[PDB]
Amino acid sequence: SNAMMTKKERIAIQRSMAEEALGKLKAIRQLCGAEDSSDSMQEVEIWTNRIKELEDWLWGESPIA
Amino acid sequence: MMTKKERIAIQRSMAEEALGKLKAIRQLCGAEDSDMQEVEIWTNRIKELEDWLWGESPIA
Amino acid sequence: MMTKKERIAIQRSMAEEALGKLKAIRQLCGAEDSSDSSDMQEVEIWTNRIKELEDWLWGESPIA
Amino acid sequence: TKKERIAIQRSMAEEALGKLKAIRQLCGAESSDMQEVEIWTNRIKELEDWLWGESPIA
Amino acid sequence: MMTKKERIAIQRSMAEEALGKLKAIRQLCGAEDMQEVEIWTNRIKELEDWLWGESPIA
Amino acid sequence: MMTKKERIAIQRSMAEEALGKLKAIRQLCGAEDSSDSSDMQEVEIWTNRIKELEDWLWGESPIA
Amino acid sequence: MTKKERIAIQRSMAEEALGKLKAIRQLCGAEDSSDSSDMQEVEIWTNRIKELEDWLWGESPIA
Amino acid sequence: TKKERIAIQRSMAEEALGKLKAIRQLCGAEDDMQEVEIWTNRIKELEDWLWGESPIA
């Protein structure tokens, strides 16, 4: 290739961006029930599980694993 | 004007983004290749911060 | 595409953005229904923890 | 011969490495799990690199 | 006493020790005196890929 | 000093121990609270894969 | 199991790993043509094993 | 009477499972252990559904 960047570099950059993506999704989860002055988890759990699933895919199975 | 509890949720949301950026940093180690110890140093420091955030900090 | 120097420079650049985000958090410690002193103590706690991280980053870390 | 004694020492080192890797598999049996796993991975790879690269049996 | 996940972690620990023993065998090739080494390498890798990729403990 | 025949006998002895270890793993399937069919599915898979290895070791491998 | 139990089990396994490494060391210079070079090998093994053992019991996840 | 009808259905399910198991037993007769394991897995899946999630569980 006549490209400056290597495949290893491109994948590292992608993995770096994936951490930011995951940070954003986890940020979302933190607002569950922020409208509720009271205490209590089912909504939170749904997010936890979907994020874990994406995170397992990213680092286990994806093109950047 | 927000309640403290609302402000803390916002702060926690933002803390996830801060953690994301640190974790992004870590992924760049050796991209151009201490190799694995460099990465381990970041793991250990990010974990210490995450542990503080969710366990000891004002937003725990 | 990157030397190690360049990659480290890029990591240092990202570290400033991470620090910005943590300092942004510290600016939201005030609230309606909490005491000013309690919120002020939060600010002090954040400040000390951010300074500890900055000191590590620029002093002791792999990117110092 | 020193060579045959060295092969035997290398065979033994593989078994020591197996026992260390066995310890790694028990992490989290009961994030920190991933920190622990990474630390064992690295210590083990460091020992392997020493055994086969630097040690008297390299 | 054990959950299935704990039992599987124990089995994975044990599989590292079995791999260690096979790798130990490989190290004795030519100890008395290379395609032979390659045969072991390839067959160990096949087993290791199965264990961690496809087996009941993967 | 060591002959090739002796080296091969040593490798064969070690192979028996490796097989013993994989057979020991097989025995733990369903050790926990488990349904007889889950157990038996796992046991079959271990049995067949161990048998395949044994066949290779004693029939096709450098130590056969 | 508890984390304490799992850690105990890992420490017990570490002792066996250390035993196997130390066993290796005993075979250096087994030949009757052994000299200062063989003793140096022994020391090189001793030092590496001590580094690992100090890590295990001082700094590791199982310390 | 629904209970009786379900009992008869469960009785028949055992015969259906037996016939599938009968099929599995012919694998490799003419001599691939993966073929047998595929059958094991698919029979288990069905048996688990029958006694665990199905209308006759």
UniProtKB/TrEMBL annotation, chain A:
It holds the Pfam family DUF6835. Transmembrane segments: none annotated. It comes from the Bacteria. This is DUF6835 domain-containing protein. InterPro entries: DUF6835, UPF0358_sf. It comes from Shewanella oneidensis (strain ATCC 700550 / JCM 31522 / CIP 106686 / LMG 19005 / NCIMB 14063 / MR-1). Residues 4-65 form the DUF6835 domain.
UniProtKB/TrEMBL annotation, chain E:
It comes from the Bacteria. Residues 1-58 form the DUF6835 domain. Pfam families: DUF6835 (PF20759). Transmembrane segments: none annotated. This is DUF6835 domain-containing protein. It comes from Shewanella oneidensis (strain ATCC 700550 / JCM 31522 / CIP 106686 / LMG 19005 / NCIMB 14063 / MR-1).
